[PDB]
């Protein structure tokens, strides 16, 4: 039509689901320590 309904807020989260996932999936910059992070 096109009404993009809560599918957008739906997808939006899901995109952020995996984004954190890879960071969690992998390591790399280990990420600004932010609660324990080994040396």
């Amino acid at each position: 039509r096109q009404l993009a309904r809560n599918w957008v807020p739906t997808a939006s989260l899901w995109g952020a689901v995996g984004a954190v996932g890879l960071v969690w999936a992998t390591d790399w910059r280990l990420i600004l320590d932010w609660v324990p992070y080994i040396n």
Binding site: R1, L3, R5, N6, W7, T10, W14
Partner: protein, 436 residues
């Protein structure tokens, strides 16, 4: 002339009155030679006890069998004298006596209708005539698959409350029932404020209220539980297999009662014999008409005092039953997320259509007035309905149906050859999308 908004505005409005002992009066004037006069009592089954169960429907017969002043079949010959038809019917929450008659004979009408409500000749001559007729009807009533399968549905969802029981009650009570309980049951539930009088027709209010006439009327709800459950009467003889699925919903007076009125218009309904074809708009009337996945189905909506039921009723052949259940839960779940402004309209319109066309004719108006008073109070908010409809918006629906549908516990009741109907823990796992 008449424009849609204007046509609302000129209607004879509700009239109201009181008597001293709590009886009520109400009426409307259609400028019409014929009139409906009636009575609507709130004495239901959900009041009645375990021994009194079924007494209500039992009493319902005896009234026209002759009474205190006018013995057996002297009464009727006066009704047939007027040529007025005469009717009565029952329901779990209500009982109704009413008459359709010319405006002329009204003086006798009430005074007749008056007597029947309270003074009733109770003669065991009649009882045994009666106790057969019921024990005649019970065993036959198996023959109609529809009416049965509902009696499954209540008992399976509501188990453990007075609402969970048959109208007519189990057969054994019909045998043991003695007119002692009746007189007690008579005495208890027929007093005012319970009672309500109404009428519509050539009657003017005041010409009624005087002949509301020097007679007399008279001198409980507890909430019910919702039990997510299942029941299957598996019988492989019969050709077709009924199903009914339902989820619990709000009571009479409540805002959400309107939103859900509209949804079940949108999903729509299909039957074997329509001239619709494969081009219909209702997404279950297009699919299930294509392959005749199901012979017919309708959605029902029932609202009790504090409680209501939402769900559909569909018939289909046994190899096919699975494919309904899936394609059904497609609909409810695409509503609670993906619904749309445009499709709302075709739902919204139909409701305006049916609501109005429901008001043609004397009796359908009067019949409404009766239950309304007991229900919403005096309110007959005709034009207000429209004003309440324009409330409905996209975000209205999806906030409403998100409550009652998504991730709930359904109530399934079915009647054989059910066999393929999936095991319970499928259905519960079919209510909530995982996003597929």
């Amino acid at each position: 002339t008449a424009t849609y908004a204007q046509a609302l505005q000129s209607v004879p409005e509700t009239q109201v009155s009181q008597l001293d002992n709590g009886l009520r009066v109400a009426s409307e004037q259609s400028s019409q030679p014929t009139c409906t006069v009636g009575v609507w009592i709130d004495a239901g089954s959900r009041y009645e006890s375990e021994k009194n169960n079924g007494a209500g429907y039992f009493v319902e017969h005896l009234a026209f069998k002759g009474t205190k002043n006018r013995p057996g079949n002297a009464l009727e010959k006066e009704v047939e004298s007027m040529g007025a038809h005469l009717n009565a019917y029952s329901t779990r929450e209500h009982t109704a006596y009413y008459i359709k008659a010319l405006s002329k004979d009204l003086p006798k009408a009430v005074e007749l209708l008056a007597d029947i409500v309270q003074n009733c000749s109770l003669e065991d001559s009649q009882i045994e005539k009666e106790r057969d007729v019921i024990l005649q009807e019970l065993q036959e009533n198996d023959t109609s698959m529809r009416d049965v399968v509902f009696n499954y549905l209540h008992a399976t969802a509501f188990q453990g409350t007075p609402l969970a029981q048959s109208v007519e009650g189990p057969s054994e009570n019909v045998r043991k029932l003695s007119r002692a309980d009746l007189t007690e049951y008579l005495s208890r539930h027929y007093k005012a404020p319970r009672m309500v009088l109404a009428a519509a027709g050539g009657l003017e209010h005041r010409q009624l209220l005087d002949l509301a006439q020097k007679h007399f009327s008279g001198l409980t709800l507890s909430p019910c539980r919702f039990t997510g459950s299942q029941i299957c009467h598996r019988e492989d003889g019969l050709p077709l297999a009924h199903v009914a699925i339902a989820v619990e919903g709000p009571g009479w007076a409540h805002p959400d009662n309107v939103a859900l009125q509209v949804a079940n218009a949108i999903i729509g309904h299909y039957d074997c014999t329509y001239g619709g074809g494969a081009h219909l708009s209702s997404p279950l009337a297009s699919i299930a008409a294509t392959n005749k996945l199901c012979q017919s189905f309708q959605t029902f909506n029932i609202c009790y005092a504090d409680t209501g039921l939402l769900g559909a009723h569909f018939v289909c052949d046994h190899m096919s039953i699975d494919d309904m259940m899936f394609v059904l839960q497609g609909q409810w779940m695409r509503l609670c997320t993906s619904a749309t402004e445009s499709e709302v309209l075709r739902g919204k319109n139909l409701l305006r259509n049916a609501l109005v066309s429901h008001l043609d004719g004397t009796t359908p108006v009067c019949e409404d007035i009766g239950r309304s008073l007991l229900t919403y109070g005096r309110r007959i908010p005709l034009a207000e309905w429209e004003s309440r409809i324009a409330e409905v918006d996209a975000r209205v629906v999806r906030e409403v149906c998100s409550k009652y549908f998504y991730d709930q516990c359904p109530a399934v009741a079915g009647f054989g050859p059910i066999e393929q109907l999936p095991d319970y823990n499928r259905i519960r796992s079919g209510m909530f999308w995982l996003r597929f």
